[PDB]
DNA sequence: CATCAAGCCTTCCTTCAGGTGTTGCTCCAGAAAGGGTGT
């Protein structure tokens, strides 16, 4: 169906996780069902789901964005965007002179159409590693191209299946190259991380049109962009 | 190459002419007596 895509400009940047602790720890004490919506917990304990989550940090140049998946996600982003938005301002007006928030909003429709040819899509950090196991699949490139194929893959599905539209199933992607390695750690000050790609290039028959996200740690702001900039980019 | 804009208000009829003159029926609905004249 559609996405919503909201931006929270500070004048100054935060990243994706850390602004997901900040507006865990700020709205804490109050309107424990925002939060539950928010961090797409389990409606009885703090555990989060283990189904898609529908709303997701992002990165934004001056501040921080949203991403709400479905009807469901854009009305929790719905009712949750103006105590967010109060609660950023009532935390940089209690210290120094006050800054002012300035907000965007974005309805992005998703769409899929399969196309004989092949077509280019370049991820930023995504993350690929999570057991022993993929590592072991990482070592021989003959064993990690198949896994990163059937990741994307999917993931594609995943997310097709969890807006609630029809995906055709004779996708044939493709993994031609990557930039960088590196790890990315879930708390501050941590000796666990995980591995992830970052610029990794990847090749799909079909063509997207709207957001789309990839591989693992998805919510914490993770193997996302938009496929509508990258056609036709510029 | 994707959205975001994807109007808002208020006007939203007014007076007046809004008939005049005529026409406004007519006629006949019988049969015999007493003359001709034409066959």
Request: aromatic share 8%; glycine share 8%; proline share 4%.
């Amino acid at each position: 169906m559609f996405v919503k895509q909201v931006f929270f400009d500070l004048g100054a940047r935060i990243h994706a996780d850390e602004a997901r602790a900040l507006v865990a720890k700020l709205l804490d004490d109050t309107q424990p069902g925002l939060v539950s919506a928010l961090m797409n917990y389990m409606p009885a304990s703090k555990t989060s789901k283990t189904e898609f989550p529908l709303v997701q940090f992002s990165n934004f140049n001056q501040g921080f964005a949203l991403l709400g998946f479905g009807e469901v996600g854009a009305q929790i982003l719905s009712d949750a965007t103006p105590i967010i938005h109060d609660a950023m301002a009532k935390l940089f007006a209690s210290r120094g002179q006050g800054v002012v928030v300035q907000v965007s909003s974005r309805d992005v429709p998703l769409s899929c159409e399969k196309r004989p040819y092949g077509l280019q899509y370049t991820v930023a950090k995504m993350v690929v590693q999570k057991k022993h196991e993929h590592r072991e699949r990482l070592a021989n490139p003959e064993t990690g191209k198949v896994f990163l194929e059937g990741l994307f893959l999917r993931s594609l599905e995943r997310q097709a299946a969890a807006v609630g539209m029809v995906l055709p199933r004779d996708l044939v992607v493709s993994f031609k190259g990557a930039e960088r390695v590196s790890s990315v750690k879930l708390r501050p000050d941590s000796t666990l991380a995980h591995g992830s790609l970052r610029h990794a290039v990847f090749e799909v028959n079909a063509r997207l049109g709207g957001l789309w996200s990839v591989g693992f740690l998805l919510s914490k702001g993770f193997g996302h962009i938009n496929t509508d900039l990258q056609l036709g980019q510029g």
